[PDB]
Write an enzyme that holds these catalytic residues in place. Structure first.
Site, short mmCIF file in Angstrom:
data_model
loop_
_atom_site.label_atom_id
_atom_site.label_comp_id
_atom_site.label_asym_id
_atom_site.label_seq_id
_atom_site.Cartn_x
_atom_site.Cartn_y
_atom_site.Cartn_z
N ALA A 298 0.99 -1.05 0.00
CA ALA A 298 0.00 0.00 0.00
C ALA A 298 1.02 1.08 0.00
O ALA A 298 2.21 0.79 -0.07
CB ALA A 298 -0.77 0.05 1.27
N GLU B 284 -2.14 -9.84 -0.25
CA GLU B 284 -3.56 -9.96 0.21
C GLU B 284 -4.62 -9.88 -0.83
O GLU B 284 -5.61 -10.64 -0.84
CB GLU B 284 -3.83 -8.93 1.31
CG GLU B 284 -2.99 -9.30 2.65
CD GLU B 284 -3.05 -8.24 3.72
OE1 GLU B 284 -2.83 -7.06 3.38
OE2 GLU B 284 -3.34 -8.51 4.95
#
Ligand SMILES: CCCCCC(=O)SCCNC(=O)CCNC(=O)[C@H](O)C(C)(C)COP(=O)(O)OP(=O)(O)OC[C@H]1O[C@@H](n2cnc3c(N)ncnc32)[C@H](O)[C@@H]1OP(=O)(O)O
Ligand SMILES: CCCCCC(=O)SCCNC(=O)CCNC(=O)[C@H](O)C(C)(C)COP(=O)(O)OP(=O)(O)OC[C@H]1O[C@@H](n2cnc3c(N)ncnc32)[C@H](O)[C@@H]1OP(=O)(O)O
Ligand SMILES: CCCCCC(=O)SCCNC(=O)CCNC(=O)[C@H](O)C(C)(C)COP(=O)(O)OP(=O)(O)OC[C@H]1O[C@@H](n2cnc3c(N)ncnc32)[C@H](O)[C@@H]1OP(=O)(O)O
Ligand SMILES: CCCCCC(=O)SCCNC(=O)CCNC(=O)[C@H](O)C(C)(C)COP(=O)(O)OP(=O)(O)OC[C@H]1O[C@@H](n2cnc3c(N)ncnc32)[C@H](O)[C@@H]1OP(=O)(O)O
Ligand SMILES: CCCCCC(=O)SCCNC(=O)CCNC(=O)[C@H](O)C(C)(C)COP(=O)(O)OP(=O)(O)OC[C@H]1O[C@@H](n2cnc3c(N)ncnc32)[C@H](O)[C@@H]1OP(=O)(O)O
EC number: 4.2.1.17
Lengths: 258, 258, 258, 258, 258, 258
Positions: A68, A112
């Protein structure tokens, strides 16, 4: 819409594969709020499109998605978190199947997002990892949960506690991914598998998917009873009658999605 | 204290790894009550030691441990069980990570003690097994539960019902252990992994460990929700701020375990 | 009785192993209601024979079984399902261990039948698959549940949504089967595993199987506690006292099945 | 916004309670899509209002709500269901507490909507029921799940399988509701229970509500451990330091919602 | 030992009952660390006393216990919790039955302590509550878990979110407690229930208790199976044979705790 | 057939209610193998009878059933239980609803048989209990599981650990039973409730019943989703269309059990 962070294309026989490609290559496709909002929008569009039977999610050839954007979280508080990473798992509510084609890095939120897909195909130089511990945090979008369920306690603990990456070949051997393809043909092979699925009956494919997902949410006793009920349901569709007649009458099946 | 059956040492960078060695080679480290009491003491002492961020548990070159002590069990009755097997799983309550470094035999209670650790590294000649059935009993400390969850039903049934041993390689391939090392360097390699885990923040590492463990105890839905709360909680520490800053500023993080 | 679809025989040392062979090769062992009925009778007879300590289930060289019988199912309806594939899991109620020796095809209901056994040994040319989706239906006897739990989400989703087969080698690597042997020795190797089980105490082996099965029905916490209880129970048997006195006394245990 | 079916209002000490009133009494508040969308927006709006700490949901004096709209559903099909009634449980996603004030009828969807609130207060002439079975269908929004967990199997089965209504008193005795008030003070009494809640710290109340809801999603062992984490997390808030200093210093608490 | 904050005595027929009386009435029995440590010692001493078969836990007439001690929690931090209220549930590991006799207040930690006993008897003026929210925290030792499971969602939510107390009669109607007696004979009435239990076989009582507790830890299917194995285990004791023999021989059973 | 221990009759309007009366009054309907065997046959016969929509199970005025047969169990051993209670829970596999009408004693296996029914109606002088502990055994057919889930931990512990009986009124208050009727009309009242149930569609009633039972086997999330699927299922039936047409046409529904 006019997308700034991803590219979408309809691909395969009859335009039946929706292709979503993360496109933020100077940041190796780090997952930021902006990009997540677009991904979510694209998934919803593909989900509502009757010509699309399956979605392929991929990134660039050096990175599916590294992370991220830390700069974006860097300044939050416990209170902020608690009261305010909300839209990050929209992909788990799509009913059509979604295949992650992972070339290069899939790390952190990137790993993820791939694990949230139903199927993962890895390129030859792909690498998977959860380096969140190196930043003083832990995986926050199923990195401790979907990973452990795929690879076993010992390897998941090693990855989540050290941050070390594993190779495409270790991922496949452990069952985190189910095929490995050359880098330059990855997405094309993922698109073929998606096409094959999309040729099946959509309402049956959605039941099957729901059934496989249920194995992480129930005892085996109750997962079997649920499956049995989805199985009885397929006898209420025309596709079921058609698939079975096709096999008896030794012809090809012609599904119509109901 | 002055231990009769174990040796303890501090090791790695800054003495950040607690080493515990089972040392009852004459009985192939059979796990009598006395030894278990000393192990649990040594673990508590590591756990309370602020210098120590991870623990390595090992036996000798020939056996990690060959099981619970059959002589101590021989004369027990059904009724002794009932009103009386007790401190056998203290290791599962330690917050810091524990790595088993298994050379040679790990059988019965000894395979079970390895599987209770977070991570297992195996020596090239190691062997795992559950030979309880050959004594007219079954595994009594997770050998039918942790084994099955690591290697699948077919291999766990074959192991538990015949008593057959498997190799280090078979254990690795099945995901019961995560690396194999030469006999003579195993313990050093395990200490190096330990030291890497110990460079990270103690409080974040404890949370990550709790989150991974939770994959065996809840549905994937509530596991993801519990992980999210632990991820939020990280934002209550100084080390989360320090890790995220260090990544953004591109420098080494200096974690202080809070 | 006088079986039309299967052949049964007693094998192994002292005839302690019951062999069941599916025998409807013109339909590649398709599992019609008639054959399931016999299979169930043969299972109940071996379970009741005190000479038999374990069962081997097998098919032909070309096929273990190709599925439920598509011609019997063709004209079923949603109301037929609901109000009337009922004895399809009788095998899960047998207390003695059952090993599937799979040569050739095990597909659809046939893959499921194998997955309901405790142990699977596969021949070199075996292939596993769930092609239900190609007929417009989904797996209805555990093929979305037991498969997923053995091979992980990615590979199960790929198999169930495309209908593609996997090889014996893929199946072993993913932990769906636990050994591979040459086509021609497969059954014999399965009878040897079986005979070893049959030499053990039938009461402890029935307990140990229960315990292993519990790993798919409970949290790890509770599975450990149930196991502990069954482990206490063993101390109520002669066989447990003999098995361990034998080890102490340096002599061969002699099990009596109590 | 310009709402057709509901009215909303801020109430209580400082406008701390948001009141949503269903208002389609020519159909006894039958829950058509239209009304749900409106309901859902109002919930969201109060959810985002930093002045509101609890919501009170209520219908008219003769019906809280008499089910979903049987005329909207008449002509749907099994394939409609599958592929296309969907926003029915948005209320379960609101983090602030929601109290149902039920006067008169709460049947079918209506009873379900009230059971999805955190708390139910009933007027003296209220009646609860699940008459779905009288239409040839079953409860579709938790009426077989939330009702059974509140009232026990015997009374739920009787209600679901006959369609018979129960009184406010039977509902309180069985724990489906927690207070009974006169028809004419019911709403105001709900509002004062809501304002008591709204006087507490909003972040702490949200954590407490989550803890309690987890009692229906986890074993007790795991619910305690989740509870324990939320409890530790409260120590990261100013509100906790403040509530606890105020007890010690014998003064009123002044909470800031962080 | 020489106790500062509790009183113990043995009571009942033949001194078969251990009675523990919390005794810090100037803090209404606030459960500080010190009192928790002596409770734990006393529990452990009755557990090991072979004359005692069940324990009665009580407080004063005006208070059973008002909570954890807010002055000792006041200055704790998040990091304190974490890497640090730990021996708070030792009572859940005692095998013999414990009955709470609650006169007066049982609030917060004190309500929790009583809910951790097997059985609660309440005096006429007792009151139960979780006022943690009024301090800006939430219940931390089962208050959101054991209360919700006993009284249902509506009433638990109301108690946990408002802090309001409920009476002995509301608690009995909701199934939180199972008898109400007069203030002055409450403790003797609880002693009677413990003595009855203590006349039964200790070993079978312990198994019965474990079987009832399993009802909060698994599905009904698996708790039925756990129970079945415990029920078979009883047939290994002399007491079971005695118990049924005596019924058939029309004479009184004489149990021997094995 | 020619039953030794039960009587059956068809009753109610259109002879739609199957009545099974336990008839072994000289042993207070102690449930010996012979009687269970007849019980299970009578239930199967009513299950298969297309005119029967519900079943009422009753004993005599003085005893529903006083338990499993203590005379048959007396001389069993641990080892007998292993290899050899077996058809004890056939009633839980019936799809049609079963209502227990309990007059007089329902103890031990008899209380458990009643709890296995969907609905319990109790006569004014009925008494429920689990006196197993007084024979040195524990409940073995759901007595520690279904009881605790109906009445809460405290009362279930008190009943199971002392063997004390509770009245009809205590049972109704605690939610173990749903109505009390005068002794001489109890069976007639239960038959009237069965008749209502049997007025509805048998296929929708069976789905409603399976849904409600699901509340004990799954978290609320998964229970809600299974229920949703069942709800969708109904739209594949003719009775769903007819019932909903009938409300809107304001006429009476004509169900046809499909
Ligand atoms: C709750 C937990 C319950 C756990 C329950 C269990 O683990 S049941 C236990 C399960 N594990 C066991 O069944 C494995 C038992 N041991 C063996 O099978 C074998 O020792 C082996 C294959 C591993 C190695 O054979 P070797 O010939 O090399 O070595 P040998 O057998 O001479 O062992 C060296 C010495 O250790 C002792 N010894 C070895 N294993 C032992 C054990 N589990 N309990 C007690 N003592 C043991 C021996 O008896 C011998 O002592 P002396 O000759 O001096 O007497
Ligand atoms: C609850 C459980 C539900 C289970 C539901 C299921 O299992 S649904 C079933 C899922 N399984 C099936 O989809 C697999 C169908 N089978 C196949 O694809 C193919 O037979 C094969 C790949 C196995 C191999 O094909 P080959 O071409 O080598 O052999 P071929 O197709 O000629 O088959 C040999 C003969 O067996 C018959 N036969 C083969 N499989 C059958 C099946 N599953 N049910 C009924 N009949 C079958 C065919 O009709 C031909 O019969 P005739 O020539 O006499 O007619
Ligand atoms: C996924 C979730 C699924 C949920 C599914 C469900 O809830 S299935 C739904 C279950 N609920 C329903 O069965 C309850 C149906 N209602 C009733 O039986 C009865 O109305 C009553 C017993 C509630 C009250 O009867 P009364 O005699 O006092 O009133 P009456 O029958 O005249 O109803 C008053 C007006 O409301 C309308 N009305 C009442 N309930 C309705 C409903 N569920 N769907 C739409 N319309 C309804 C009627 O048509 C009439 O309007 P008009 O005269 O203008 O036509
Ligand atoms: C993991 C577990 C976490 C558990 C957490 C918890 O239980 S959190 C705690 C939750 N429970 C508390 O919120 C309840 C706190 N107490 C009260 O509300 C009130 O005392 C009461 C309603 C019970 C009774 O009020 P009264 O006015 O009748 O009595 P009063 O308040 O004067 O206090 C009597 C004396 O006891 C002390 N006291 C009372 N409760 C206490 C507590 N929980 N911890 C510390 N000390 C306490 C007070 O300081 C005063 O001492 P001095 O005269 O020296 O000042
Ligand atoms: C898996 C499931 C396991 C289940 C396990 C269990 O249920 S264990 C079973 C638990 N239930 C029992 O413990 C209750 C046992 N029975 C009693 O306590 C009592 O009979 C009673 C309190 C209900 C009623 O006392 P009364 O004196 O009126 O009646 P009485 O005792 O004389 O019973 C009348 C006749 O029936 C017989 N009788 C009663 N209960 C019996 C039973 N469970 N099994 C066999 N026989 C029984 C007596 O022995 C007597 O026959 P004769 O005078 O000819 O002798």
């Amino acid at each position: 819409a006019n997308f700034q962070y991803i590219i979408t294309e309809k691909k395969g026989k009859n335009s039946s594969v929706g292709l979503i490609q993360l496109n933020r290559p100077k940041a190796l496709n780090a997952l930021c709020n902006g990009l997540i909002e677009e991904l979510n929008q694209a998934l919803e569009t593909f989900e509502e499109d009757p010509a699309v039977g399956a979605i392929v999610l991929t990134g660039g050839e050096k990175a599916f998605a590294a992370g991220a954007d830390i700069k974006e979280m860097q300044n939050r508080t416990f209170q902020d978190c608690y009261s305010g990473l909300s839209h990050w798992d929209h992909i788990t509510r799509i009913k059509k199947p979604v295949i992650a084609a992972v070339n290069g890095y899939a790390l952190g939120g990137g790993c993820e997002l791939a694990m949230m897909c139903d199927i993962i195909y890895a390129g030859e130089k792909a690498q998977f990892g959860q380096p969140e511990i190196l930043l003083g945090t832990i995986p926050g979008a199923g990195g401790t949960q979907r990973l452990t369920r795929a690879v076993g306690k010992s390897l998941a603990m090693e990855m989540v506690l050290t941050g070390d990456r594993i190779s495409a070949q270790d991922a496949k051997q452990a069952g985190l991914v189910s095929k490995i393809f050359p880098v330059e043909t990855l997405v094309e092979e993922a698109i073929q598998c998606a096409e094959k699925i999309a040729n099946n009956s959509k309402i049956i494919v959605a039941m099957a998917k729901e059934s496989v997902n249920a194995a992480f949410e129930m005892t085996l006793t109750e997962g079997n009873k649920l499956e049995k009920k989805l199985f009885y349901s397929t006898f209420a569709t025309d596709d079921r009658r058609e698939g079975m007649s096709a096999f008896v009458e030794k012809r090809k099946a012609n599904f119509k999605d109901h």
